[PDB]
Design a protein around this ligand. Structure first.
Ligand SMILES: CC(C)CCOP(=O)(O)OP(=O)(O)O
Ligand SMILES: CC(C)CCOP(=O)(O)OP(=O)(O)O
Lengths: 281, 283
């Protein structure tokens, strides 16, 4: 199967995993729970779950066990978008070809839905059945998701980003904003997949981190290029050197995978992802 | 002496809170300045009091209890920052001072509340709790999450909104409170007990009774004090004096639940003083 079919397949897996935890929730007939479902399940590429699944599978972890961190990272991802769309934030009327949550359900419902999705990520990690995941590793997973999603990571990146409005920050500052705003949660997806496998996965982390941060930045560069085809990669470097940048970052990602392949790990899915990113634009 | 124990637990909870907020990165950013303003300035710290009092009953150290005390207060703090927003309760003032969104703008207030919720989970998974088991630590995280999310606090805030000016009946009103404020108050007690482990876990059945009783009693008493100190309240549905009776009956339950524990060599004096304080407050 081609990567487009793989993405379709993961989207369906990520979607099941998501609904398996969302459907048993109380208050289903309320605007807020309806907003949570709209905001979490309708559209999206599910790249964070993909990373959890792909990384976990390399270490021989079942899809059942991985459904948990895959849904949990997507819950953090979904909540951030709901809050980021708010008029006080990015103020978006449309997302995923659909009116954003605050437009459809109202700001209060959007605020609460986002708040509750964050919490659900932690309930999932602390409650989901993961038969071969030790208690120590589960705490590492929770700890990782929390530092990556909070002020040290995602929130902290969003803070920096709003502060950078109208400041035309240099490339190094820009990459720092991205590393925290999106890099941290993408690194978390990979880290949760490997922690899932225990000590074996825990040893591949320094290399997996390099892969994750590199593809995290490569995604942002491609997004920026797609926008033209605040500071952005193209605005700072010019189109050609932004394309070069994405190519450089994917090379960095492949070097990381090279180290994993040398440890007899199947990097095919992670390699397929680097391939998909660089063929973009 | 109890009003002095409260001031003592407040200064302590604040220390705990600062312990976990101060070393965070980006200290010189509006968002972080907002988390500090919202978490630390003003408040009675009753949830932390519940954590400290329940834990101390089992001889758990304060240094250890600083974690669950700070974590529950972060959840509480974040809920107020978000609830104060114009789209929600729309409050310009709180604790006698401008609210977060008024002082720092909505964007910051939104982000700071989000980051405080995350911090609660970073505290429970990272804090040094030398005597706390991994299975218990996990139970402490699971509990905070269930109590704070759609099944607890957020779900209560929703029920409360979806009921905007609907004159809900008594059962619906109690359901709103049970989730909106009861769950987190019970979580405070449940976390204090969990840190102790086995001894604490066996006390939960009775501790929950105490927690649920005082949780509702706080709300009934708030309603009473709003009257003598449309949306449904206890005096509006029951009558002022029937609301007082209701609060009094709740504290009785709380005292009885505690007897059962004091009947197992547990010093319930602090939890007793709190139950008495609830029903006795005049402002
Ligand atoms: C483009 C956009 C505003 C949506 C943000 O999410 P994202 O593009 O980081 O999500 P993925 O790159 O993981 O698909
Ligand atoms: C004044 C008053 C007791 C009402 C404040 O209620 P709150 O929920 O903000 O805090 P408590 O639960 O500690 O009372």
């Amino acid at each position: 199967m081609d990567f487009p079919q793989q993405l379709e397949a993961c989207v369906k897996q990520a979607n099941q995993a998501l609904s398996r935890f969302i459907a048993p929730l109380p208050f289903q007939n309320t605007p807020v729970v309806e907003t949570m479902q709209y905001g979490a399940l309708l559209g999206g590429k599910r790249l964070r779950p993909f990373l959890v699944y792909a990384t976990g599978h390399m270490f021989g972890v079942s899809t059942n066990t991985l459904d948990a961190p895959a849904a949990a990272v997507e819950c953090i991802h979904a909540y951030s978008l709901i809050h980021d769309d708010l008029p006080a934030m990015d103020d978006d009327d449309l997302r995923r070809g659909l009116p954003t949550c605050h437009v459809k359900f109202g700001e209060a419902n959007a605020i609460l839905a986002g708040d509750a999705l964050q919490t659900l990520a932690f309930s999932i990690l602390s409650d989901a059945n993961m038969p071969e995941v030790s208690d120590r590793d589960r705490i590492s997973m929770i700890s990782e998701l929390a530092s990556a999603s909070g002020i040290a990571g995602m929130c902290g990146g969003q803070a920096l980003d709003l502060d950078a409005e109208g400041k035309h920050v240099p490339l190094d500052a820009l990459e720092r904003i991205h590393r925290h705003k999106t890099g941290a949660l993408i690194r978390a997806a990979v880290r949760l997949g490997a922690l899932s496998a225990g000590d074996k996965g825990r040893r591949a982390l320094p290399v997996l981190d390099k892969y994750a941060e590199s593809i995290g930045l490569a995604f942002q560069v491609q997004d920026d290029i797609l926008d033209v085809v605040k500071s952005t990669y193209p605005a700072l470097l010019g189109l050609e050197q932004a394309r070069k940048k994405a190519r450089d970052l994917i090379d960095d990602a492949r070097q990381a995978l090279k180290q994993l392949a040398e440890q007899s790990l199947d990097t095919s899915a992670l390699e397929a992802l680097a391939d998909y990113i660089i063929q973009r634009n």
